[PDB]
């Protein structure tokens, strides 16, 4: 979908994210709902 700041890259339901952790020694996979936060330049408001 679209961000409230008219940007692109928001996923509106369950997302699968693959993250490397601990200096590239662990690979994790989270299937979680990704909610935007409301902080300045932090996925909230009209400035992003």
């Amino acid at each position: 979908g679209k961000f409230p700041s008219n940007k692109t890259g928001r996923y509106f339901n369950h997302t699968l994210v693959i993250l490397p952790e601990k200096c590239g020694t662990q690979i994790t996979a989270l299937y979680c709902v990704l909610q935007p936060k409301n902080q300045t330049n932090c996925t909230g408001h009209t400035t992003y």
Binding site: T40, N41, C42
Partner: peptide, 28 residues
């Protein structure tokens, strides 16, 4: 929360490595 700098102009150097079928690079 964290102010970052987004500038894709410096991120365009190519150094391409295309797929070589004779080595089976991406064969599952």
């Amino acid at each position: 929360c964290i102010v970052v700098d987004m500038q894709p102009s410096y991120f365009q150097r190519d150094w391409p490595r295309p797929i070589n079928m004779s080595a089976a690079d991406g064969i599952i």
